[PDB]
Design a protein around this motif. Structure first.
Motif, PDB file in Angstrom:
ATOM      1  N   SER A 197       2.155   3.116   2.423  1.00 17.56           N
ATOM      2  CA  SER A 197       1.696   4.167   3.316  1.00 17.56           C
ATOM      3  C   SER A 197       2.796   5.198   3.551  1.00 17.56           C
ATOM      4  CB  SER A 197       1.294   3.577   4.667  1.00 17.56           C
ATOM      5  OG  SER A 197       1.355   4.565   5.686  1.00 17.56           O
TER       6      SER A 197
ATOM      7  N   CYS B 231      -5.174   1.980   5.616  1.00 14.07           N
ATOM      8  CA  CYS B 231      -5.982   1.934   4.402  1.00 14.07           C
ATOM      9  C   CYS B 231      -5.155   2.201   3.147  1.00 14.07           C
ATOM     10  CB  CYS B 231      -7.095   2.981   4.460  1.00 14.07           C
ATOM     11  SG  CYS B 231      -8.294   2.846   5.826  1.00 14.07           S
ATOM     12  N   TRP B 232      -5.225   1.306   2.171  1.00 12.60           N
ATOM     13  CA  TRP B 232      -4.507   1.530   0.921  1.00 12.60           C
ATOM     14  C   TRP B 232      -5.344   1.151  -0.303  1.00 12.60           C
ATOM     15  CZ3 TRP B 232      -2.890  -2.636  -2.276  1.00 12.60           C
ATOM     16  CH2 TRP B 232      -3.024  -3.921  -1.710  1.00 12.60           C
TER      17      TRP B 232
ATOM     18  N   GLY C 120       0.814  -1.202   0.000  1.00 16.49           N
ATOM     19  CA  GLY C 120       0.000   0.000   0.000  1.00 16.49           C
ATOM     20  C   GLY C 120       0.851   1.258   0.000  1.00 16.49           C
TER      21      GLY C 120
ATOM     22  N   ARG D 266      -8.490  14.550   2.342  1.00 12.10           N
ATOM     23  CA  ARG D 266      -9.912  14.330   2.569  1.00 12.10           C
ATOM     24  C   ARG D 266     -10.644  15.424   3.331  1.00 12.10           C
ATOM     25  NH1 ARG D 266     -12.029   8.523   2.709  1.00 12.10           N
ATOM     26  NH2 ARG D 266     -10.505   7.390   1.413  1.00 12.10           N
TER      27      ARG D 266
ATOM     28  N   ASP E  68     -15.228  11.527   3.583  1.00 15.34           N
ATOM     29  CA  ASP E  68     -15.130  10.672   2.409  1.00 15.34           C
ATOM     30  C   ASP E  68     -15.071  11.426   1.079  1.00 15.34           C
ATOM     31  OD1 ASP E  68     -14.796   8.042   1.451  1.00 15.34           O
ATOM     32  OD2 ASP E  68     -16.929   7.856   0.966  1.00 15.34           O
ATOM     33  N   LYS E  69     -14.644  12.685   1.127  1.00 16.89           N
ATOM     34  CA  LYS E  69     -14.501  13.493  -0.083  1.00 16.89           C
ATOM     35  C   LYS E  69     -13.008  13.750  -0.261  1.00 16.89           C
ATOM     36  CE  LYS E  69     -18.376  13.997  -2.060  1.00 16.89           C
ATOM     37  NZ  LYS E  69     -19.260  12.816  -2.216  1.00 16.89           N
TER      38      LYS E  69
ATOM     39  N   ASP F 105      -8.340   6.625   9.474  1.00 19.64           N
ATOM     40  CA  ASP F 105      -7.477   6.109   8.417  1.00 19.64           C
ATOM     41  C   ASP F 105      -6.977   4.683   8.638  1.00 19.64           C
ATOM     42  OD1 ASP F 105      -6.243   6.442   5.874  1.00 19.64           O
ATOM     43  OD2 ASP F 105      -4.355   7.037   6.819  1.00 19.64           O
TER      44      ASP F 105
ATOM     45  N   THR G  51      -4.191  11.440   4.397  1.00 22.75           N
ATOM     46  CA  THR G  51      -4.188  10.015   4.703  1.00 22.75           C
ATOM     47  C   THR G  51      -2.877   9.364   4.268  1.00 22.75           C
ATOM     48  OG1 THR G  51      -5.153   9.420   2.566  1.00 22.75           O
ATOM     49  CG2 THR G  51      -6.676   9.965   4.364  1.00 22.75           C
ATOM     50  N   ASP G  52      -2.569   8.214   4.851  1.00 21.67           N
ATOM     51  CA  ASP G  52      -1.343   7.513   4.500  1.00 21.67           C
ATOM     52  C   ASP G  52      -1.284   7.229   2.999  1.00 21.67           C
ATOM     53  OD1 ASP G  52      -0.758   7.496   7.240  1.00 21.67           O
ATOM     54  OD2 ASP G  52      -1.755   5.568   7.541  1.00 21.67           O
ATOM     55  N   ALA G  53      -2.442   7.205   2.341  1.00 14.87           N
ATOM     56  CA  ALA G  53      -2.482   6.942   0.901  1.00 14.87           C
ATOM     57  C   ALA G  53      -2.147   8.189   0.090  1.00 14.87           C
ATOM     58  CB  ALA G  53      -3.859   6.405   0.490  1.00 14.87           C
TER      59      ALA G  53
ATOM     60  N   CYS H 296     -13.962   9.727  -2.946  1.00 10.23           N
ATOM     61  CA  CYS H 296     -12.647   9.105  -2.841  1.00 10.23           C
ATOM     62  C   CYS H 296     -12.649   7.694  -3.422  1.00 10.23           C
ATOM     63  CB  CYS H 296     -12.219   9.021  -1.379  1.00 10.23           C
ATOM     64  SG  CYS H 296     -11.964  10.587  -0.493  1.00 10.23           S
ATOM     65  N   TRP H 297     -11.644   7.372  -4.232  1.00 15.95           N
ATOM     66  CA  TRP H 297     -11.552   6.041  -4.820  1.00 15.95           C
ATOM     67  C   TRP H 297     -10.118   5.539  -4.983  1.00 15.95           C
ATOM     68  CZ3 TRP H 297      -9.415   5.294  -9.823  1.00 15.95           C
ATOM     69  CH2 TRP H 297      -9.191   6.466 -10.567  1.00 15.95           C
TER      70      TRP H 297
ATOM     71  N   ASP I 272      -9.465  16.559  -5.594  1.00 14.41           N
ATOM     72  CA  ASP I 272      -9.379  15.862  -6.869  1.00 14.41           C
ATOM     73  C   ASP I 272      -9.005  16.737  -8.064  1.00 14.41           C
ATOM     74  OD1 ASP I 272     -10.845  15.183  -9.460  1.00 14.41           O
ATOM     75  OD2 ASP I 272     -11.048  13.251  -8.420  1.00 14.41           O
TER      76      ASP I 272
ATOM     77  N   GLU J 234      -4.077  11.129   0.221  1.00 16.60           N
ATOM     78  CA  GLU J 234      -5.273  11.895  -0.127  1.00 16.60           C
ATOM     79  C   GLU J 234      -5.469  13.068   0.825  1.00 16.60           C
ATOM     80  OE1 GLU J 234      -7.374   8.529   1.175  1.00 16.60           O
ATOM     81  OE2 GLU J 234      -8.363   8.187  -0.758  1.00 16.60           O
TER      82      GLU J 234
ATOM     83  N   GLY K 103     -14.042   5.244 -10.324  1.00 16.98           N
ATOM     84  CA  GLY K 103     -13.952   4.969  -8.903  1.00 16.98           C
ATOM     85  C   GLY K 103     -15.015   3.989  -8.452  1.00 16.98           C
TER      86      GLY K 103
ATOM     87  N   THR L 129     -17.208   3.479   3.468  1.00 13.19           N
ATOM     88  CA  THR L 129     -16.922   4.454   2.420  1.00 13.19           C
ATOM     89  C   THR L 129     -17.506   4.004   1.089  1.00 13.19           C
ATOM     90  OG1 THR L 129     -14.814   3.397   1.806  1.00 13.19           O
ATOM     91  CG2 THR L 129     -14.743   5.077   3.544  1.00 13.19           C
TER      92      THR L 129
ATOM     93  N   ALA M 225     -15.928   3.450  -1.478  1.00  8.86           N
ATOM     94  CA  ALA M 225     -14.980   2.490  -2.036  1.00  8.86           C
ATOM     95  C   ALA M 225     -15.192   1.119  -1.407  1.00  8.86           C
ATOM     96  CB  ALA M 225     -13.553   2.959  -1.793  1.00  8.86           C
TER      97      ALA M 225
ATOM     98  N   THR N 119       4.151   4.980   7.274  1.00  9.57           N
ATOM     99  CA  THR N 119       4.987   3.820   7.519  1.00  9.57           C
ATOM    100  C   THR N 119       6.344   3.968   6.838  1.00  9.57           C
ATOM    101  OG1 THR N 119       2.965   2.498   7.586  1.00  9.57           O
ATOM    102  CG2 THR N 119       5.047   1.330   7.512  1.00  9.57           C
TER     103      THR N 119
END
Ligand SMILES: OC[C@@H]1O[C@@H](O[C@@H]2[C@@H](O)[C@H](O[C@@H]3CO[C@@H](O)[C@H](O)[C@H]3O)OC[C@H]2O)[C@H](O)[C@H]1O
Ligand SMILES: OC[C@@H]1O[C@@H](O[C@@H]2[C@@H](O)[C@H](O[C@@H]3CO[C@@H](O)[C@H](O)[C@H]3O)OC[C@H]2O)[C@H](O)[C@H]1O
Ligand SMILES: O[C@@H]1[C@@H](O)[C@H](O[C@@H]2CO[C@@H](O)[C@H](O)[C@H]2O)OC[C@H]1O
Ligand SMILES: O[C@@H]1[C@@H](O)[C@H](O[C@@H]2CO[C@@H](O)[C@H](O)[C@H]2O)OC[C@H]1O
Ligand SMILES: O[C@@H]1[C@@H](O)[C@H](O[C@@H]2CO[C@@H](O)[C@H](O)[C@H]2O)OC[C@H]1O
Ligand SMILES: O[C@@H]1[C@@H](O)[C@H](O[C@@H]2CO[C@@H](O)[C@H](O)[C@H]2O)OC[C@H]1O
Ligand SMILES: O[C@@H]1[C@@H](O)[C@@H](O)OC[C@H]1O
Ligand SMILES: O[C@@H]1[C@@H](O)[C@H](O)OC[C@H]1O
Ligand SMILES: O[C@@H]1[C@@H](O)[C@H](O)OC[C@H]1O
Lengths: 436, 436
Positions: free
Chosen positions: A243, B382-383, A241, A359, A363-364, B363, A353-355, A382-383, A367, A357, B241, B353, B355, A246
């Motif tokens: 992150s 989350c990834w 993932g 937000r 959940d938005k 998160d 977020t760790d990804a 979010c996707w 983009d 994003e 998405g 979510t 997704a 991490t």
């Protein structure tokens, strides 16, 4: 400098490397990234047992030297991988036992190390000699059967072959301090150091995923091994993932340990990874830097000054003094974001977020609708798309992973209502953001 | 038979279709899904102009018939796509203009409809005749250049060639009512009805992405056209998405308009999509149902008579009355979740979510490290992995997208501390969860 991983790591006397695959050195996109970002190289397969000695007595160093040469020519040291291992053994070695194998192992070591004598910074002399049975004992292999003292012999042999190389014991799932495997490896190394066995380092593969997650105690593990009197190195890092937190945490664990020589990630782009399904590296298949890439660069460079808006916070434009705001707290997908006087409100609270994003409302996602200058920046469900992932540069700029462009206040506007777009980064104040 | 999209759509008098590629019909995984879930078929490319009339006056229906034959053989109706279009024109046609192109256009319609006469439910007679410049005007193509009346001529020609088929005008970016293109098409259709031009339907492609996102005013658009005296159909639905909410919303919009004949998603699995990079369909490449699938199915079935836990909430097992709990409110990756007395604590508040993730702490994601029975359900960063996505079935069970298994209270345990695992779905109360 501080714009590439290798240069950033060098600032603290460390290196940041990767695993090179010889078949890719012909790929310009691949080599453009590799030659630039890393100052340490590990041949992904070219220097293993089956590859360097296809037939007992007959050594082949063609593929290996290929990787070695590219590395040195492009300013990178090399980690030799690996001399004594139960896996990827050529067929002829897989049928050897007793005193003959022990002898075969010794020869192999002398042969490979002789060839690269004085050219290798670190050698993974022995790899994965402990089991995952939860007992903390030796893995059951033809090598282990030649005698419990095989590891010691391997290391003594290596020291003789090439005293210039740092000798490491390498393994996985030895990162979490509470694990028996970790403890077994720890006891072995402590013993080696007490009895005088020639071991200079321990390599932590660091292959983290939800099966065997990274744990903050990883630093404790590194510190304990370092206290034994040996160097430590993150040898094959990849995180499922990828992150940001991490990757930044592993990076900081190394930086927190004086004896941590450096970090090597296991591959260049996610598409080159032996576990591409986990998109565990720092570069996308298209060559773009991921959110985790910038989190690592920042950590290596020392980071910021004060803690960030860990989950929930405003993003204020430097040139305008105004905050990133979602017009009328709208939740409509496609709504373009704007600049507005900062005030407590959810439409101004962004979570990184760790990804990667940004937000809002939970959940938005911030983009980007395209990849060129002028692209509108808005909110959208979010996707996980790369057009919804951002890199937080230490210079205050926020860059889209997919587009490689900066968040930009249209025309350098500072007034309420100024819209936000993507545009070639310029270090301008309308592209710099801080915290309220 | 509310267990499949087609059967569930049929309970409201509607159909649910897909786009079939003949070259994938030899793929059992593809056909198993396509045959089971849809009762309407559109040929993704096999009935287009270039494919049906390779040389002027020489018609070829082999590819078209492969798709058609499979459709009727498996009880599906067929949407003919498409007769007059500026795109995917064979070379010989692209070279035409004026009266010669006008007659070629008419000749093509006559040849294709004649071969399929009486076998096609709907025909996309004209495709994408309007521009995107935002003026609501006609697209500048060789077809438009033959005269502004070309679309009318196409429809009169179509009615005469096969009066048993519904004649549709198909286009994209005509879903948001505020867009000029949408109104331009509305004015044309209105014009046709007034002057007696044969037209029975308007197809809204519905290719939604951040560039042109779904807008709730889509329901008014469908209502507006319906009022002109024509049926409407969602023809090439795919959402960047695959937001569960957006998919459910589009479904409900169609079900809100009596004249909305049905919905067609443009493809079976994301890997079959012309835009796989946007993972915009309802099934994964491995054939597994996505979170959006369940949302569409539930929407088609009328949904729940009470609003789900919008913005956080507890998940309580019926067979225990206890809530999904993260041991000691730990935020450590790898921590297996458990059943525990429900109480207002964040370590018990889960958010679903779009997704399809079950987030905790903001998160952290409900995670499964494995796809087999007995696999421990834990929390991990989350990834977006499919092992972090879940489907909320109407029967109250929560199924893993990647594994296809249900959250299970180990040994049917009920007391506090009872661990959660993945196990073959049962109707048991230790796999049933009430949304409280
Ligand atoms: O697409 C045509 C027009 O171009 C965009 O609008 C531009 C906007 O992109 C531009 O931004 C400036 C560019 O220079 C940078 O140094 C500065 O930071 C940035 O704000 O400003 C002029 C504006 O007209 C849109 O696509 C559209 O307006
Ligand atoms: O990548 C090669 C093949 O391309 C996909 O097929 C696409 C087809 O899906 C596409 O359909 C168009 C999409 O836009 C709509 O406006 C239009 O009405 C519709 O017909 O047309 C191009 C064609 O190449 C195959 O699935 C993929 O294998
Ligand atoms: O080859 C090695 C793999 O066998 C090893 O597998 C790990 C076993 O423990 C699990 O908890 C981990 O999730 C799994 O990856 O990983 C390291 C690799 O080098
Ligand atoms: O291409 C693959 C390599 O990336 C892989 O590398 C090994 C992964 O597990 C680690 O424990 C080993 O140390 C490392 O060499 O080996 C297999 C090869 O196909
Ligand atoms: O070929 C056509 C594309 O040009 C068309 O592009 C659309 C332009 O408007 C945007 O808002 C849409 O997101 C984008 O898809 O899409 C349809 C395709 O057939
Ligand atoms: O290891 C054992 C599990 O495999 C066992 O799993 C049960 C299988 O049947 C299902 O109906 C139950 O819900 C599920 O818990 O549970 C006991 C455990 O010891
Ligand atoms: O916060 C609001 C912003 O989102 C819009 O413009 C008015 C402001 O008050
Ligand atoms: O309270 C006000 C807030 O509601 C508005 O959105 O922005 C200005 C603030 O002062
Ligand atoms: O996680 C549990 C917590 O929620 C509860 O309050 O106390 C017991 C813990 O095990």
């Amino acid at each position: 400098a501080e714009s590439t991983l290798g240069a950033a790591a060098a600032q603290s006397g460390r290196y940041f490397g990767t695993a090179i695959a010889s078949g890719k050195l012909g790929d310009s996109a691949y080599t453009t990234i590799a030659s630039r970002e890393f100052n340490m190289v590990t041949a992904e397969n070219e220097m293993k047992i089956d590859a360097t000695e296809p037939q007992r007595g007959q050594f082949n160093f063609s593929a290996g030297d290929r990787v070695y040469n590219w590395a040195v020519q492009n300013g990178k040291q090399v980690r030799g991988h690996t001399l004594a291992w139960h896996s990827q053994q050529p067929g002829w070695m897989q049928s050897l036992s007793g005193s003959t194998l022990r002898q075969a192992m010794i020869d192999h070591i002398n042969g490979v190390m002789g060839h690269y004598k004085g050219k290798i910074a670190q050698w993974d002399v022995v790899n994965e000699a402990f089991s995952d049975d939860g007992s903390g004992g030796r893995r059951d292999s033809n090598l282990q059967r030649t005698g419990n003292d095989w590891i010691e012999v391997a290391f003594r042999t290596a020291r003789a072959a090439d005293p210039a190389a740092k000798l490491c014991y390498n393994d996985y799932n030895i990162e979490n301090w509470t694990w028996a495997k970790t403890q077994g490896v720890y006891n072995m190394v402590r013993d080696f150091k007490q009895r005088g066995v020639p071991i200079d380092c321990v390599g932590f593969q660091s292959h983290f995923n939800s099966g065997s997650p990274y744990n903050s105690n990883f630093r404790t593990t590194l510190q304990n091994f370092a206290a034994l009197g040996v160097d430590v190195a993150i040898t094959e890092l990849d995180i499922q993932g990828a992150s940001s937190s991490t990757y930044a945490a592993v990076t900081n664990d190394c930086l927190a340990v004086s004896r941590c020589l450096g970090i090597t990630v296991w591959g260049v782009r996610d598409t080159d990874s032996w576990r591409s399904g986990d998109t565990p590296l720092l570069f996308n298949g298209d060559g773009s830097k991921k959110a985790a890439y910038t989190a690592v660069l920042n950590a290596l460079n020392g980071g910021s000054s004060t803690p960030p808006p860990s989950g929930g916070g405003q993003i204020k434009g430097v040139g305008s003094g105004r905050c990133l705001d979602v017009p009328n707290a709208s939740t409509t997908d496609g709504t373009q974001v704007q600049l507005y006087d900062c005030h407590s409100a959810t439409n101004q609270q962004w979570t990184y977020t760790d990804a990667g994003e940004l937000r809002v409302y939970g959940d938005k996602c911030l983009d980007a609708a395209g990849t060129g200058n002028g692209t509108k920046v808005q909110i959208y469900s979010c996707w996980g798309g790369d057009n919804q992932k951002w890199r937080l540069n230490s210079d205050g700029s926020i860059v889209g992973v997919q587009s490689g462009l900066c968040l930009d206040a249209v025309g350098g506007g500072t007034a309420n209502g100024t819209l936000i777009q993507l545009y070639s980064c310029s270090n301008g104040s309308n592209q710099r953001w801080t915290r309220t």
